[PDB]
Design an enzyme around this catalytic site. Structure first.
Site, short mmCIF file in Angstrom:
data_model
loop_
_atom_site.label_atom_id
_atom_site.label_comp_id
_atom_site.label_asym_id
_atom_site.label_seq_id
_atom_site.Cartn_x
_atom_site.Cartn_y
_atom_site.Cartn_z
N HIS B 71 0.82 -1.30 0.06
CA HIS B 71 0.02 0.13 0.04
C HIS B 71 1.04 1.26 -0.06
CE1 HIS B 71 0.25 1.16 4.38
NE2 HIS B 71 0.22 0.06 4.65
N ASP B 95 0.04 -7.73 1.44
CA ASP B 95 0.68 -6.38 1.68
C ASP B 95 2.06 -6.28 1.79
OD1 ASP B 95 0.35 -3.56 1.45
OD2 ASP B 95 -0.70 -3.50 3.49
N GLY B 151 2.46 6.81 8.61
CA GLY B 151 4.33 6.87 8.07
C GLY B 151 5.13 5.64 8.75
N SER B 153 4.17 2.48 8.78
CA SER B 153 4.01 1.01 7.94
C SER B 153 5.39 0.52 7.36
CB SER B 153 3.06 0.96 6.94
OG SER B 153 3.19 1.77 5.82
N1 PW1 Z 1 -5.21 -6.55 4.66
C1 PW1 Z 1 -5.40 -6.51 3.21
C2 PW1 Z 1 -4.62 -5.68 2.55
C3 PW1 Z 1 -3.87 -6.08 1.47
C4 PW1 Z 1 -3.04 -5.30 0.72
C5 PW1 Z 1 -3.19 -3.80 0.78
F1 PW1 Z 1 -2.51 -3.28 0.00
C6 PW1 Z 1 -4.03 -3.44 1.77
O1 PW1 Z 1 -4.13 -1.99 1.91
C7 PW1 Z 1 -5.12 -1.31 1.24
C8 PW1 Z 1 -5.07 0.04 1.58
C9 PW1 Z 1 -6.01 1.07 1.27
C10 PW1 Z 1 -7.15 0.39 0.41
C11 PW1 Z 1 -7.00 -1.03 -0.09
C12 PW1 Z 1 -6.04 -1.74 0.67
C13 PW1 Z 1 -4.78 -4.43 2.60
F2 PW1 Z 1 -5.64 -3.62 3.38
#
Ligand code: PW1
Ligand code: PW1
Lengths: 642, 645
Positions: B71, B95, B151, B153
């Site tokens: 993300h 993620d 910030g 993550s």
């Molecule tokens: N836990 C499942 C998951 C997976 C991957 C991501 F990037 C993620 O992060 C987002 C952020 C904003 C919107 C949609 C996804 C997420 F939650």
């Protein structure tokens, strides 16, 4: 950084469309160089700084925009940075001589009441003129839509300029009207003299006048000038925000000028009957403001200061002085609104690098820069002070922390030391140092009109402004050689303060000075209406409405919040009052709410939340009538900048 | 742009865990290093502070790999000493992305022992004690505003020995206060290290002996929707093909009968045909209206355009994934040219040329030369209908055959055949199947996002955002089909692909309630199947929250709901529900925007403050918060909400 043109809005009935001429990298390099070769065209520019994008409009050969966006910044130009030809902080108006190629709009004089606002999206919005500087939107829009449009033209149908947009007037986040700088204000500004000389004390006038004195620290604004006036036979009051500086003026004066002045502070008063009196703004307020016939001259020193006691003190003076028989009020500062930090002769300025044993705000401090001598290190929070002092002490360096709540005696005053301090130092201790090291950031409070249910006071860490940078650096290089080391070379524009400070003024009026909200408003209006002082959005009616509903506070809770010395003793105590009476728990069990601790077993239920002064952990109810009253207060017209 | 290292967080080597930071790059430095992707600064420390143009966050080298969150980083390269470093691992579902660390870089190593006492390192260099409460979850000893964690993550959770338990990815929040934290376990990383870096999903999978879900990643024109169901049919299998578009669905059906000699079942709103053939083409909406999988009907279900994040598709695919095995299917194929994590690469048929400020036609801060669009058939993508109308108006003015197309209008207003400039929104891609001599792209999109604003409840906000890689590829795909094509753009964009907002989940509950007679509980089962299935677009898990909200929204007025359904605007259930509470309180709607048109006839009798349930747009009327449904939704806001950090 310089302001930089990044696009334009081309005008044609009225229609418009935008052109982007620069991307991010271009904007940033051009801001740092101040060198913009791009040919400028048109009358409306899209401009940007590092933090913000807004508009600028050329009229009469001058490219105009808002102080709140551009501050005192130069404009990147074909031959390098262009310094402002005009800076009017009171009117929220600055101007640079229009660069070659730029066209100007012509002022509108016939004067139609149908107006058209050109936004940064190149929309043309109909507006019905309502005053000299005000117009209603025919279709109310979310303020979010108007943001970035500060500096854009309000046009009459013939395409002549009526003024430039500076602020939205809002009901719960919806803009119903717009405030603009009228072209007549631009004409008045153009006709004023660029350099007005305020460095010398004015002579006492025949009838009452407010004057400005802009002069450096050590120029005797607070000693030599009051002495000179007394020698002419006048009686003179000198107000200062610092207890330490106020007390210090008395010893200096009986030594250096043969006068034993009256001294008034909360901690100590001395009445000699002399014709010069030194007082803190806070003690002056405690004593009930101006006493009739006591003073001919009132000097309000450090009049750039935007703490609530100073603002309230100054407004009191401005409201009361003429009537109390004074002939002269002098507003004195070394750093007036719109001032910028410039090189100082006594002070070598050296950027911190990444080399050194001591980490500091992403950079480093060599132990050799502070091992011997007397050094001051400004940190943004007491937590940082405590830790950096512990680190230095662990390395055998004589180091001490200072911040609000500690006694200044933690010093020493003599001998080698590194003082690690917040800005509380400015008001607690008057001495100078071999070097100052500056994190270049400050903690501040800002109001968020968040409607959840009411408002929120947020505590944030921000880049320092030019007053901060100059005042922190000014703790070295006083009649001797000094060094200023820094993490960051920037400085935000000076002379502006947040609506939260207005809230703090009402709070202090109620908590400490026995002022009704209406009386606080009269004193703040005098401040706001007086030019040359720090500026703010006019939220007086709003904050007055809020405090006006806060009746029958519990005296005990208030005494305890006052005594504990935190920031909004009255709001805190009032929330605690309604919690206790509703037989309900506080928003959390943070230290802020400690005055309720002995009632903690008999609490229970959701908190009747009035407003947010921190994290809210407990459940909340919106049923209390004070909550509902404050909710109703949120429907007031609120100036918000765009 | 590459991700660039701008600082580092240095950890204590002995005794208590403490930390401090070092900033290695300013703004200009970062922007330049992003563009060149070339970074000569050597990489000290094991925790890096990294930034893109838009945001900053952390990355933690564990075992030679510099790991961070998808993300934050998307699929971007990392600026490196010899130029951009391509990702070695991209796991969208976890993620988690990873770049191989430069030789000599320092790296943490995994938590061998296994403590329940953890310490999170933030971008501020604070060390925050955390109580482990599961494989990927831990409690904060002292609850904090989530703003304090943003910030951070990608930063490590450490055990007392200073060894890595995992990397921080999200906070669990109650009304804006973080009480717990989610992280990617170091075990999820050590797998990826040991496993193959490349996957090939370019061929249709063989039908397996027992139920499996498989992915097919292959271009438009490889026949994902024609050739491969036909080939499966030719092996004696019964195949269901799902697509988001009616026009594409009807188009495939027709092509199949003309080309591959099968007359398939067709199932759509406008046209339903049963021939008894072993291939069936359906839209996801019709499939949902039909009640999902019927027992024993199909061996194979192809979920085509499975990158789509409209609520019908998500709910459609979720239904297939929950029902298909029990309905007797052997194979679900999740099919797209643009899966999560994908990036636009050059296409040989397509010449890509940046717009400049030179040209007669203003276009999103740049300009289109008239000569580029006078000779031929051309497609201009605009973000809104207003802009489509204003641009068409201008183009015809300058003597060009220009028509506008967006939702609400009928296709075939597009000549077939003729010679034209079509100015359109994304609705084009589901209303019309043709291709063009060039495509001109504004590179931005209208989207909806949920803000948990507590004023009193939530807000659905409409915004204009940069396009993602799916949008870019799909908009660019309307030229250079079988022949030469030209793609003109305002920006070289691509936000990362494969993520959708929590508002889309809201939309799925709304659509379940409005269109498909799904209780919120039933919607949750289907959505759960989608989220739990890997390789699909991903979202934060707010299923319980949204279920709770819709569960309380009972006794809607059927008349208002039928008018919002028919009008075709977003959130018909929530709009009709707000209108229902207004009409029954004889109160005005929040505004007289067209959203509230079902209430226009009643305006003369509507008085006082609106009992506001939530915010779907600007609110102009005064509001009251005493409605029992307002209070019920307020109480729903106490739910644990995953929020990315
Ligand atoms: N836990 C499942 C998951 C997976 C991957 C991501 F990037 C993620 O992060 C987002 C952020 C904003 C919107 C949609 C996804 C997420 F939650
Ligand atoms: N109308 C008085 C006025 C004057 C000048 C300003 F810059 C200004 O703008 C701000 C903006 C934020 C804070 C303080 C002042 C302002 F309101």
């Amino acid at each position: 950084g310089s302001v930089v043109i990044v696009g334009r809005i081309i005008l044609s009935s009225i229609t418009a469309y935008s052109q982007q001429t620069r991307g991010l990298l271009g904007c940033i390099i051009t801001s740092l160089t101040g060198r913009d070769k791009n040919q400028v065209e048109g009358e409306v520019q899209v401009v940007s700084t590092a933090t913000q994008s807004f508009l600028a409009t050329c009229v009469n050969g001058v490219c105009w925009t808002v102080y709140h966006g551009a501050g005192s910044k130069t404009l990147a130009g074909p031959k390098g940075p262009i310094t402002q030809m005009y800076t009017n902080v009171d009117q929220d108006l600055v101007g640079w001589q229009a660069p070659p190629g730029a066209r100007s709009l012509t002022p509108c004089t016939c004067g139609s009441s149908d107006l058209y606002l050109v936004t940064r999206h190149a929309d043309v919005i109909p507006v019905r003129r309502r005053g000299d500087s005000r117009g209603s939107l025919l279709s109310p829009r979310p303020v979010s839509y108007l943001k970035g449009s500060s500096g854009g033209p309000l046009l009459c149908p013939s395409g002549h300029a009526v003024g430039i947009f500076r602020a939205a007037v809002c009901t719960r986040g919806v803009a119903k009207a717009v405030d603009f700088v009228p072209v007549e204000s631009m004409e008045t500004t153009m006709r004023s003299p660029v350099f007005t000389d305020n460095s010398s004390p004015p002579a006492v006038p025949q009838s009452f006048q407010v004057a400005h004195l802009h002069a450096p620290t050590g120029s005797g604004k607070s000693t030599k000038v009051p002495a000179a006036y007394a020698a002419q036979g006048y009686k003179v009051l000198v107000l200062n925000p610092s207890v330490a500086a106020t007390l210090g003026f008395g010893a200096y004066m009986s030594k250096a000028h043969g006068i034993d002045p009256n001294i008034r502070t909360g901690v100590r008063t001395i009445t000699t009957g002399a014709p010069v009196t030194y007082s803190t703004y806070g003690k002056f307020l405690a004593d009930g403001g101006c006493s009739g016939g006591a003073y001919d001259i009132i000097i309000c020193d450090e009049c750039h200061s935007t703490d609530s006691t100073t603002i309230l003190g100054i407004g009191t003076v401005l409201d009361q002085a003429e009537t109390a028989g004074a002939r002269l009020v002098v507003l004195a500062t070394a750093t007036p609104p719109g001032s910028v930090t410039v090189p100082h002769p006594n002070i070598e300025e050296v950027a911190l690098s990444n080399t050194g044993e001591i980490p500091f705000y992403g950079k480093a401090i060599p132990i050799e820069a502070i091992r011997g001598g007397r050094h001051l290190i400004f940190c943004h929070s007491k937590k940082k002070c405590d830790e950096l002092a512990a680190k230095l002490s662990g390395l055998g360096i004589n180091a001490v922390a200072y911040y609000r709540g500690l006694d200044v005696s933690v010093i020493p005053t003599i001998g080698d030391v590194v003082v690690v301090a917040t800005d509380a130092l400015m008001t607690g201790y008057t001495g100078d140092f071999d070097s100052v090291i500056d994190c270049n950031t400050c903690v501040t409070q800002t109001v968020d009109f968040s409607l959840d249910p009411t408002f929120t006071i947020e505590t944030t860490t921000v880049p320092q402004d030019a007053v901060s940078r100059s005042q922190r650096r000014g703790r070295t290089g006083r009649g001797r050689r000094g060094i200023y080391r820094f993490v960051t070379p920037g400085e935000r524009p000076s002379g502006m303060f947040d609506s939260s400070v207005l809230c703090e003024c009402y709070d202090a009026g109620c908590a400490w000075y026995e002022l009704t909200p209406a009386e606080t408003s009269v004193r703040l209006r005098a401040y706001l209406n007086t030019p040359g002082l720090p500026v703010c959005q006019d939220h007086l009616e709003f904050w007055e409405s809020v405090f006006t509903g806060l009746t029958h506070i519990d005296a005990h809770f208030l005494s305890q919040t006052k005594q504990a010395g935190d920031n909004f003793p009255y709001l805190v105590a009032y929330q605690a009052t309604v919690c206790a009476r509703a037989q309900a728990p506080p928003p959390s069990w943070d230290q802020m709410w400690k005055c309720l601790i002995r009632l903690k077993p008999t609490l229970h239920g959701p908190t009747p939340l009035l407003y947010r002064l921190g994290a809210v952990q407990n459940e909340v109810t919106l049923t209390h009538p004070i909550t509902k009253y404050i909710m109703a207060c949120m429907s007031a017209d609120l100036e918000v900048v765009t």
